[PDB]
Amino acid sequence: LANKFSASTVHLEHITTALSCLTPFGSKDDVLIFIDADGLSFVRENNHVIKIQLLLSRELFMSYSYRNETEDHMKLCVKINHILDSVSVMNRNSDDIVECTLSYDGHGSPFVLIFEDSFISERVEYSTYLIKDFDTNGLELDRERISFEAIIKGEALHSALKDLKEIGCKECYVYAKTEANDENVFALISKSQLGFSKIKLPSNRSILEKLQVFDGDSTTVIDGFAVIGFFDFTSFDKIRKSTKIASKVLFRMDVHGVLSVNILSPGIVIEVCMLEKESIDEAAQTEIELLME
Amino acid sequence: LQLPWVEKYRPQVLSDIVGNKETIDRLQQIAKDGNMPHMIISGMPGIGKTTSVHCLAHELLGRSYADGVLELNASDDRGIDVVRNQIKHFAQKKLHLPPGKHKIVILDEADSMTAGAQQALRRTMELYSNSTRFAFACNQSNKIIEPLQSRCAILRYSKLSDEDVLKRLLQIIKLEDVKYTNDGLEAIIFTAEGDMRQAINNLQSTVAGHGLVNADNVFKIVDSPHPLIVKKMLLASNLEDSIQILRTDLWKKGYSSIDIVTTSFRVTKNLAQVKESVRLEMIKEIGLTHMRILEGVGTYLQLASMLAKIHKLNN
Amino acid sequence: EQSLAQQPWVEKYRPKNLDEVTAQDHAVTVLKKTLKSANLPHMLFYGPPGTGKTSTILALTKELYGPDLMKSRILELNASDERGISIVREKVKNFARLTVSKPSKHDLENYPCPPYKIIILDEADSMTADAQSALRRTMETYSGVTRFCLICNYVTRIIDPLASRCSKFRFKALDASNAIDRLRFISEQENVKCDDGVLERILDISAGDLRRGITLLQSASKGAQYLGDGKNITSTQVEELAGVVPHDILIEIVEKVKSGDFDEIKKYVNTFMKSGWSAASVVNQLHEYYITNDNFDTNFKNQISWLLFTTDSRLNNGTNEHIQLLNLLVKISQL
Amino acid sequence: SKENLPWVEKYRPETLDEVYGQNEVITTVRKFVDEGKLPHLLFYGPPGTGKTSTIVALAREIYGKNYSNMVLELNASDDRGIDVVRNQIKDFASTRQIFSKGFKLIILDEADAMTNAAQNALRRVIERYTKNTRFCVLANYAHKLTPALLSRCTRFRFQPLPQEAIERRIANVLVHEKLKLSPNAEKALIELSNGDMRRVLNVLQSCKATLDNPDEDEISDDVIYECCGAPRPSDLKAVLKSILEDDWGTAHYTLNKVRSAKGLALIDLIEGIVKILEDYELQNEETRVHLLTKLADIEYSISKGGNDQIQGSAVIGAIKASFEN
Ligand SMILES: Nc1ncnc2c1ncn2[C@@H]1O[C@H](COP(=O)(O)OP(=O)(O)OP(O)(O)=S)[C@@H](O)[C@H]1O
């Protein structure tokens, strides 16, 4: 095509899945679209405290053309409510839709979404907006100062998130500890109306594939030390939709209080970065210690 | 980093709180006795109400402060549902405390609570007064509904005197090893107008700015309270003097006309020397000028005309 | 021919380009040179009714963008639209943040196409103070892609921060000295035959409003065409169409006031108000008569000037014309 | 890109060294950041004195060029109700820094537009999280701020811009552009600025536009008056002289001619005459009272429209009657 970027596919599950994953970040706000030869990424940020990035790779599209030469990537911003409404009306007859193509022609042009059916094609153009000065790359995991890492199965994490949500969890604490004889302890401690509750993942290579505590440098493994991360549930719960489709989840917390969740569902890959609370109260610390001991 | 002096030197104990000596002594008596009743603490900003209530709770509950105190303020959710669930569950909690000690529910800025929540608090206080006690903190005691006031002992804090402000300022200076002069401390106290939070903020700003707290150095950053300037302007016996004050001391310093007229109304409300007829006529003229300003004509000419009319009223 | 003759003269002869705008060169020059400098600032047009503010902004937008690009580069809101704080914070903000649309090759070759949009807030003086405050940082933050144009008759209704943010342009009153050429051109285009001095009389009566003068000229032309006698229009007909009290009636009022009898003045005013004369015109004519009269002293002129000012302010407040006129006449009689 | 911007935004200070006319405040804040002891700040002042520019420059100095990542800026164009304070501001203030870059900064520009409930909710947010966060409030009207919020903030007053700072900024703009300004033109520009730099920049841009050949033409006071359509001092002096010495007919004719020569507005003439009379030495004080009252009434009436000729005659009569005392 004559467009700078044009990607067409026959699977409509990827688009709706990505939109559903992005929904928990606000039904009426902005979404950033990054376009490059590797693929197309959707980025959202909330309150400068949490960030989500969902990547659709080149393999997911039956055809993918990126003819831009001056710039190696293209950045645009759209309103999520517009896309949500347009797709909801256009996707009412989900059985008949056969092709879906995205297109873009550089700055100053709309983002074009076309649903192609057997004999009817629907074309919608989304207006673009200036990108806010805030840089989404600011909230990133310092890969040289990982406090701990863990690999978890998607279903168990999704069940834990559902349990936390249903009890009206208000504060969450991620507790990670390692010992000898391959003893691992990964737990989520919730402060809610019920008081203090705990959800502990088993130390087996089917729900907790691996767990490591690196003493805040990613190199030296230390046993007997416990890493505790304090988060507000309003931001922690925003990964529930992503975990619903997730096949594997990788938690990585650094010393700067940044937690990164890598969700793997050819596929959809999601990155969620969140900041930790300023500090933990004495009562919360005492309750957590009593729960874990 | 280093905390600002206002938060760094917040008292931890009742003994370090100055001003309202009788009230603080009563609070210390309650703290050392234990039988704390429902209480309301009212007063102007920055005089130690929050500090006093928190210190009293800490001293009363000792190690049990974490599990025996429930603190809520205007920045938290405090609707009727909160009263129905969180406060109710806290008051129902069975906590073993030393004899004469009770759980404390601190409601800072209680005046802002909604009517429904305040009405709901009545039954909670009636049912759980045996093991729970409420400490309301507010600026306007009348903003708490009468049924709640009926159960509480009232405690009104007065504005701090220059002596107590000077004493605590000297303590802070001794702790910080700050070089100063007497005139500088007098200027700081004069500008504070009885608000100690402002006094400490201005002291820190002056110490940073020049290191030595002099009157000239204090007045370089901190300005004299504009209400006193407005009072001097209004009480001037000559129209020329009033106009000169309005120009040099208020208009040329960037004070907005709306602020000037509002301050003029507030000051005129408390002019004891003037007669009642003159006072009400001045209030009428100030109100007319305020109405003109609100329409968009916020000019120096309107303020000058208001001053001229006030002077006519005086004659 | 009928299609072109299906519009009132005010809309028919609305300026198309900035060259057609008259008597407002002090701002038109800056706006014109902006077409080359491409450095348009935020604008605050203010002035009395019918001086060419809306026409000027429309002509500027047309010259900048053109028939096609304008539809994507212009957002116009006026008093007929909802302009609450929510509107300012959502719709205006969204448009101001919109990316600059790509011009077409024809647009680029035919028009300058500056790289920003324009938001026009006509009758901005009707907006609330809070809504105006909501615009302050929107105007500054997105000045790289958006420029604001506020238009008003009462500049004091614009909050000071907005006036500071906007470069101010005062539109002058259009009178017989600076707007005569445009009116003469309009009359020539319509073949309106009038006696010498009629156009100047119309402009004097309009009192700074060219729209009113054009409407009066159209009314006179319609009357002359209906009569179909071939005679030139006269100043008396223009005065009658404009609602000017005849000189004899004003003289009768003046003699009644000079007599000083309350009952006679009351009866004469009661009979006079039956005709339906607008009190504003009568007050203006009385001011012109008394202030320029050489038979009265300085104290009388000072007192009557203050009385006329008070009466005019009261009338502008929307008061009963009969009561105000009778009070003014009695007061002048007691002088 | 900066070339296309309006001069008011093109010349926005980027560093604290570029902010003029606020030496005391600027020195205090600079040394505070040098010592890393920034308290909660309030910047109170009239329009266009450099409050927003100063706070943005301070944020840039504190956080270098990445201030946008650890600075939360909110103004009147955004909703700032009690729900916003409870959720967004609270969550930002209670979270750790991006890279442990000291403390976070929250800027509440135009905070006088916030509701009482939101301001009340802000008190404990400011107090509790002082260690991790610092608040900056900016205002033009202090009466809209609650007493508690004022008590919690260290106050700094931005005065109207002094003449020397305006001259230095004008010289900087003139060297930046290829523009020449006459001393009388600069004096008139400062006089009409009223301590607002935005007005100076806008009028200078309009004057440059007015020049036929800006590469060589020099801006004179006449150019400034043409661009602003304001009366000249000579016109005001002549009108006042005619009012105070000539008869009613002569004064009326003089006022009409002076106004028709350049299409001057009556309100501008009234303001100029008021400024002139403020320096007059009056031996009778009732004259000042009558002048002020009547001229304020005339200004208020003009603000709502009305008849222009009647208002001008009213000004003449009011001045004459006041000086007849
Ligand atoms: N009586 C006092 N003695 C010593 N320091 C005081 C006193 N009053 C105020 N301060 C200082 O000011 C700070 C604020 O005191 P607070 O008690 O929180 O103010 P406040 O009386 O609660 O005003 P409001 O109602 O909350 S606006 C304290 O942390 C102290 O540093």
Ligand SMILES: Nc1ncnc2c1ncn2[C@@H]1O[C@H](COP(=O)(O)OP(=O)(O)OP(O)(O)=S)[C@@H](O)[C@H]1O
């Ligand atoms: N300067 C002018 N040059 C030419 N025609 C003008 C001029 N001013 C007014 N007119 C005529 O009057 C009509 C109305 O002009 P506008 O630009 O709408 O006046 P206005 O300043 O917008 O009046 P307001 O403020 O809305 S009451 C135009 O369509 C023209 O026919």
Ligand SMILES: Nc1ncnc2c1ncn2[C@@H]1O[C@H](COP(=O)(O)OP(=O)(O)OP(O)(O)=S)[C@@H](O)[C@H]1O
């Ligand atoms: N002190 C100053 N030094 C230099 N330029 C200034 C100064 N103050 C204002 N300016 C100029 O005026 C513009 C506006 O300044 P601001 O700081 O945004 O105004 P302000 O003080 O915030 O007034 P408000 O409250 O927003 S109406 C700046 O971009 C500069 O071009």
Ligand SMILES: [Mg+2]
């Ligand atoms: Mg308090």
Ligand SMILES: [Mg+2]
């Ligand atoms: Mg118009």
Ligand SMILES: [Mg+2]
């Ligand atoms: Mg500002």
